[PDB]
Every structure is written in structure tokens, then in C-alpha cells.
Ligand binder design. Structure first.
Ligand code: HEM
Ligand SMILES: O=C(N[C@@H](Cc1c[nH]c2ccccc12)C(=O)Nc1ccncc1)c1ccc(-c2cccc(F)c2)cc1F
Length: 450
């Protein structure tokens, strides 16, 4: 049971961080075919990171349980945002109970009015910033706004949106996000040091909890006198009760709510943006025409069944945008026990990684991996890990693709788009969640005449 092959280090303390930083895909691709191995070890500032770049071996990463392959350590830099003691910072069963409640709230059973709520909100956007016959806009920005507005409309009741609208909420979320130092996965010390930024999320957190409390107290004042039939993500979570029979504290409720919105914000937008960029490119008229054929029968007011059931192709477009260019590049676990990966053994201490970026460009799994083709299929079973797998698979997946499909459907009905460059935009590897390079997403909308 040998250690996997490790790439020679040529920079004493830093290791491979510089090179891995400049060009992720390339670096890993070279490491792979340099060492003729899908499984291999690199070195981040002293730390050993074993990457599992062989899709046939994805199950050895996604199936071991928390006690052998743990997310706490590596995702503890998210504490300021979810809360101390919430999600990854909680006892694993408590962590698990928590995520289950969240999942219960985002299942397809709860999707009844989401689609009309999403359209109303999309149309509202389109009719205020896309209100000319032709226009230049930044599509990434604009899908981001659309995504957050639709999330809020699906997930929050009117009374909360009166106090906290999507605009306000994006700002509180940005404050929160500005204190994140993902660097601290490899330099833990940073999680314990106060920084210029540290205070910023706490201020937005306390403002957010303050609002939720006041909302709940008023909700109580009207249940004194009514059915108050409508429920939302908030009332959902407040009726949750742990196995031990105690309910969630406000701190935890709020943690789940931001964790929800935060998680979906960039990933769903980026996925929308990419899909449209691909669909509007000359080279992909074939696919744009196909999508539009799928939409052709549909009514103005879309419904649960149109987008849940009658849009296979729109889904393939979203999933393939993710496949070509996944928003999350490196997924990670801390190795609690020696564990067996293919012909190798990964020792206790290692950070173990599985990278959707790498696996989605395995030429066997995905012939011509830089070609965006919505009709392809994985040539290896399980090579698509865009939404993770096994114990920590994405729980927002369905809600996410609901937003994207409804947005594509609503957009491409009323409009055409004109990419303002020759080629589709390049990914930008220099942000924690990756998307098309923002400065390259300026785009022209054209209102359709029919
Ligand atoms: C296109 C949209 C999305 C993509 C590409 C995406 C991607 C992923 C991936 C790759 C994972 C696995 C993480 C890992 O294995 O370490 C994951 C997990 C997760 N995602 Fe998403 N996600 C999306 C949307 C959402 C949304 C809308 C939510 C919630 C509102 C959400 C909540 C989560 C949660 C809670 C997990 C936790 C898995 C766990 O630890 O049990 N995601 N997502
Ligand atoms: O790492 C980041 N975000 C993770 C968080 C995450 C990891 N495990 C998760 C499990 C559930 C939910 C969220 C996460 C994420 O979005 N993960 C996720 C997981 C599952 N589904 C969807 C999404 C992140 C890091 C830095 C920044 C940033 C941006 C601007 C300025 C700045 F200073 C920093 C933004 C980010 F967003």
C-alpha cells in the first residue's frame, strides 16, 4: 500500500501554491500526465493534498463518512457566515439534523408557486432594465440580481420582504462574504486572528437576527387572531424540532437561511450566465433553436409541470455549462484515517481532494471537454461531480436548476442576445467561486418582435 506519487517541490516553504494558483486545470493536468497517475499528491504551504483525478475512483472520495473523511476542518473558514456552532462547526449528527431541515425546505414538494414567483420577478427585472428594443448590459451581474430576487420571492413571505427586500439582503450577504478568507483551509492560524475585515459579517449577522426576531414576534401577534396559512423558509425552520425534542435557536435558523442563499447565489447565477452565453453564440444556433423548440408550446404563465417535466433540454444545457466550467473547482476533506484509493493509500493528516474541474476534462470521460455540447453523456459513470456526491451531495440542486430553467425559459422567449466578442468568455480562476470573466460578459439584448 504505497503513498501516491508526489509532484517535485521547487519552492521551499510555499510548495505548489503559486503554480496551482496561476493555472489550476493546467497544473493538475500536467501533474496527472507527468506522473502517469490519476491519483497524486501536491503540497500547499507545507500541507499534503492528495487529488483524486481518476473518475473511476470518485466513490472513494464521496462515500466515506464524516468520521473518516471530514468536512469540519477544511470548511471551518465559513464559520463567520453560518455561525459558530452551525453546520460544519457542529457535532456531526447535529450538523446532519440541521442540513436535513434545510433539505426538507427545498424539496420539490415545496415548489408549488415558485415558478410563477420566479417569472413575476424575472419579468419585473426585464421590464425595468431590459425595457428598450436593444440594449447593452452585463449578463453576469444581471443574472446575479435576478437569481437573488427570485430566491427571496420563493423563500420569504411578504411580511419579511417588507423589512428585508432582496436588495437589502444582497448587501448583508456581501458584508458577510467580505470577511471570508478561504486561504485559511491551509493556514488555520488565520481563523483565530482578528482582521480589518473580521467585524463586518458579525455586524450584518446581528442586523439580520434582529430583523428576524421582530418579524417572528409580529407573526405571533397575528396568529393570536388568524390561520396565517402561508408559510415560508423561516416558518419552516422554526417548526423544526431536533431528535432530542428541542427546537432550533434563532442563531441556527438564521445560519441556515444565509447558508442557503449564500450557497446558491453565485453557483446558480454563474450557471445561468454560462448557459446563455453558450446559447447566444453563433456556433451553437443548433442548440438555441432546439431550446426554443422546447419552449414553443408553452404559455405565458409557466407552471410547476412545464419546467419540472417538459424541459429536458434546458436541463442538459445547465448541467453542461457546469460540466464544461464548474463553479466549485476543488472539493475537500480532511483525512481522519488512512484510507484506500485505487492502488494507493492516503494517510491520516492529508487533505484529500476531488476536483470537478479536473474530472470534467478527463478525455475518456468527456471527449473534447472544452466543447460545450448539451447532448453529450459522461463516458464514465460518475465522472460528473458538478453537484458532488454521496453523503455531501448538493441539497439545493433541484431549486437551483428550477431557477435556471425558469430564467432561460423566460428570457429566451421574450429576447435575443448578441455576444459582444468573437469567442465565449474565459473562466476566471481568481475567485473562490468561479465564473466567466466578468469584464468579458457585456452582451446585447434584443427584444423579439414575435
Ligand atoms: C448550480 C448550483 C449549485 C451547484 C453547482 C452546487 C454545487 C455543490 C457541490 C459541488 C456540493 C458538494 C460540496 C462538497 O462535496 O464538499 C454542494 C453541496 C451543497 N450545496 Fe450546493 N450547489 C448548488 C446550489 C445549491 C443551492 C441553491 C443550495 C442551497 C440553497 C445548495 C446547498 C448546498 C448544501 C447545503 C450542500 C451541503 C452538502 C452537505 O455538506 O451535506 N447548493 N453543492
Ligand atoms: O467558498 C466559498 N463559498 C462556498 C462556501 C461553502 C463551502 N461549503 C459549503 C456548504 C454549504 C454552503 C456553502 C458552502 C460555497 O459557495 N459552497 C457551496 C456549496 C454547495 N452548494 C453551493 C455552494 C467562497 C469563498 C470566498 C468568497 C469571497 C467572495 C468575495 C470576496 C471575498 F473576500 C471572498 C465567496 C465564496 F462564496
Amino acid at each position: 500500500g504505497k503513498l501516491p506519487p508526489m509532484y517535485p517541490v521547487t519552492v521551499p516553504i510555499l510548495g505548489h501554491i503559486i503554480q496551482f494558483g496561476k493555472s489550476p486545470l493546467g497544473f493538475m493536468q500536467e501533474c496527472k500526465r507527468q506522473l502517469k497517475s490519476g491519483i497524486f499528491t501536491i503540497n500547499i504551504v507545507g500541507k499534503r493534498v492528495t487529488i483524486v483525478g481518476d473518475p473511476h475512483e470518485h466513490s472513494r472520495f464521496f462515500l466515506p463518512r464524516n468520521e473518516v473523511l471530514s468536512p469540519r476542518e477544511v470548511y471551518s473558514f465559513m464559520v463567520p457566515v453560518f455561525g459558530e456552532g452551525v453546520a460544519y462547526a457542529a457535532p456531526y449528527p447535529r450538523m446532519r439534523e440541521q442540513l436535513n431541515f434545510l433539505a426538507e425546505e427545498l424539496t420539490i414538494a415545496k415548489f408549488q408557486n415558485f415558478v410563477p414567483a420566479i417569472q413575476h420577478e424575472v419579468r419585473k427585472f426585464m421590464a425595468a432594465n431590459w425595457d428598450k428594443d436593444e440594449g447593452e448590459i452585463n449578463l453576469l451581474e444581471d443574472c446575479s440580481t435576478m437569481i437573488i430576487n427570485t430566491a427571496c420571492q420563493c423563500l420569504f413571505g411578504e411580511d419579511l420582504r417588507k423589512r428585508l427586500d432582496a436588495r437589502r439582503f444582497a448587501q448583508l450577504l456581501a458584508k458577510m462574504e467580505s470577511s471570508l478568507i478561504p486561504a485559511a483551509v491551509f493556514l488555520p492560524i488565520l481563523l483565530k486572528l482578528p482582521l480589518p475585515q473580521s467585524a463586518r459579517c458579525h455586524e450584518a449577522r446581528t442586523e439580520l437576527q434582529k430583523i428576524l426576531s421582530e418579524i417572528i414576534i409580529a407573526r405571533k401577534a397575528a396568529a393570536v387572531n388568524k390561520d396565517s396559512s402561508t408559510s415560508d423558509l423561516l416558518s419552516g425552520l422554526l417548526s423544526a424540532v431536533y431528535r432530542d425534542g428541542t427546537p432550533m435557536s434563532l442563531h441556527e435558523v438564521c445560519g441556515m437561511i444565509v447558508a442557503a442563499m449564500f450557497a446558491g447565489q453565485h453557483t446558480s447565477s454563474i450557471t445561468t450566465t454560462w448557459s446563455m452565453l453558450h446559447l447566444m453564440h453563433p456556433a451553437n444556433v443548433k442548440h438555441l433553436e432546439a431550446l426554443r423548440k422546447e419552449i414553443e408550446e408553452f404559455p405565458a404563465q409557466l407552471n410547476y409541470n412545464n419546467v419540472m417535466d417538459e424541459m429536458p433540454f434546458a436541463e442538459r444545457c445547465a448541467r453542461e455549462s457546469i460540466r464544461r466550467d464548474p463553479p466549485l473547482l476543488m472539493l475537500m476533506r480532511k483525512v481522519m484515517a488512512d484510507v484506500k484509493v485505487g492502488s494507493y493509500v492516503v494517510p491520516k493528516g492529508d487533505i484529500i481532494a476531488c476536483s470537478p474541474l479536473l474530472s470534467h476534462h478527463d478525455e475518456e470521460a468527456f471527449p473534447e471537454p472544452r466543447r460545450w455540447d448539451p447532448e453529450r453523456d459522461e463516458k464514465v459513470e460518475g465522472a460528473f461531480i458538478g453537484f458532488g456526491a454521496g453523503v455531501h451531495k448538493c441539497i439545493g440542486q433541484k431549486f437551483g436548476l428550477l431557477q435556471v430553467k425558469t430564467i432561460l425559459a423566460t428570457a429566451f422567449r421574450s429576447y435575443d442576445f448578441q455576444l459582444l466578442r468573437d469567442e465565449v468568455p474565459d473562466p476566471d480562476y481568481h475567485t473562490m467561486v468561479v465564473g466567466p470573466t466578468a469584464s468579458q460578459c457585456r452582451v446585447k439584448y434584443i427584444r423579439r418582435k414575435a
